[PDB]
């Protein structure tokens, strides 16, 4: 966005109130209303569809694959697409590289539940398409 | 014009065009006409309206970009190998399909179009 300077003071004024004030005036800990849909891409292992209040829009797909869990280290892969942008851009790649760290295989991920055999397991694909933000 | 191909079922080319014809009317952009699209396949002698990707890899297929109610074409694309002699008949198939396409687009917009002003006003 490109906003105007006279707002930017007032916006920085009102939110930095000591009885702090949002532009929509929520309580300081609130979030905004959303919508959450899933289970709608029946070719997939799982699907997802989420709706923001400003009309920001994404869908994340779940496809799986069986793999040898010894020849491969990363058992869980995230891959992200933002509409309107190049692959090469910054905000793409950082958010992309982030959720890999967020879903490291034994950090908050319980890869034993992913484990198929003593030799095999499940490669998963967190595949992300953002319409708009 | 932004495209997001989600689930793919074969017949992929004419699938697009029918989505386009919505989207231009979806803002109400100035235009002449409906434009319809459909892949129709050929198993040995027999035309197949509305093939799927299983059938697409199984035989020869042709997609037609058909304009409105007419007999004039926007898109015509053939990859597979086709014996010549069927082709006039093959082309004669898809029009009745294509006319039923822009048929079903129309009322479906219209019942939406009624839903506006009846509750707008």
């Amino acid at each position: 966005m490109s906003l105007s300077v006279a707002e930017k003071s007032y916006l920085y004024d009102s939110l930095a109130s000591t009885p702090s004030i949002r532009p929509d005036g929520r309580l300081p800990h609130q979030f905004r209303p959303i919508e959450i849909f899933t289970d709608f891409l029946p070719s997939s292992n799982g699907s997802s569809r989420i709706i923001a209040s400003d009309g920001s829009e994404c869908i994340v797909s779940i496809k799986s694959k069986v793999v040898d869990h010894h020849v491969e280290n990363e058992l869980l892969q995230v891959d992200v697409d933002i509409a309107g942008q190049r692959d090469d851009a910054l905000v793409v790649e950082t958010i992309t590289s982030l959720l890999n760290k967020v879903l490291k295989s034994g950090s908050g991920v319980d890869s034993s539940k992913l484990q198929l055999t003593k030799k095999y397991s499940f490669k998963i694909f967190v595949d992300v398409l953002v319409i708009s933000s | 014009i932004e495209i997001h191909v989600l689930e793919q079922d074969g017949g992929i080319m004419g699938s697009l065009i029918n989505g386009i014809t919505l989207a231009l009317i979806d803002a109400g952009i100035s235009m002449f006409d409906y434009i319809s699209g459909i892949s129709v396949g050929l198993y040995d002698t027999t035309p197949l309206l509305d093939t799927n990707s299983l059938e697409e890899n199984a035989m020869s297929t042709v997609t037609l970009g058909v304009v409105g109610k007419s007999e004039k074409l926007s898109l015509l694309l053939v990859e597979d190998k086709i014996p010549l002699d069927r082709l006039e008949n093959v082309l004669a198939i898809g029009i009745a399909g294509a006319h039923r396409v822009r048929d079903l687009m129309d009322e479906e917009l219209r019942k939406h179009a009624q839903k506006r002003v009846s509750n707008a006003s």
Binding site: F31, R49 | A113
Partner: peptide, 27 residues
Amino acid sequence: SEVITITKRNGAFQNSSDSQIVTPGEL
């Protein structure tokens, strides 16, 4: 007394004065 509206609906892409109303291509 809340933070966010989280209401769920799973298994679907979507939930699913008279005058002349005309279309393009139409006479």
